[PDB]
């Protein structure tokens with residue numbers, strides 16, 4: 001799975017927690033980064049939704065092999081192709 | 090330390106002139122009634138006064154020349170007359 005940086009809500013909150021160690025995720029940090037990007041519906045979040053999304057983001061960023069960020073390099077803004085090839089390999 | 094002016098000035102007496110500054114605080118709710126949120130912390134509301142020749146908002150705090158009605162010395166005309174003593178209780 002390749003995520004694209006500078007795109008939207010869920011993309012940015014996955015892309016920020018890419019290179020982080022797996023134990024360094026705090027459930028406080030999740031809702032902190034969540035409510036700024038979800039600032040339209042940030043107040044619509046409950047604690048059970050926060051712990052579910054924290055568990056899911058944890059179990060995703062565990063498997064570091066199967067994920068890549070596009071990084072939105074934005075100096076050439078080359079293609080999706082350069083990302084998709086490394087995410088294949 | 091030193092201030093640069095000898096004397097009493099516009100103060101009542103020498104030394105300290107004792108006064109009480111009360112503050113009222115409450116939370117700031119959204120359209121739903123939940124707490125509005127900052128980046129991390131929350132939003133707070135205080136009740137302030139503006140005098141016609143002060144050109145400034147300030148706390149309703151009075152000189153502690155009377156004992157218990159020093160908030161009333163700030164807020165007899167502001168708060169109430171009889172219910173003011175109840176809120177002072």
Ligand SMILES: Nc1ncnc2c1ncn2[C@@H]1O[C@H](COP(=O)(O)OP(=O)(O)OC[C@H]2O[C@@H](O)[C@H](O)[C@@H]2O)[C@@H](O)[C@H]1O
Nearest residue numbers: 099100101139140141142143144145147148150151152163
């Ligand atoms: N900590 C302070 N910070 C800023 N200004 C101050 C402070 N303390 C006093 N002042 C200013 O000093 C001036 C004289 O002080 P007082 O008159 O003793 O203060 P107070 O009794 O709280 O204000 C009386 C108010 O009634 C009006 O007639 C007059 O315009 C004044 O705003 C006031 O205009 C007040 O704005």
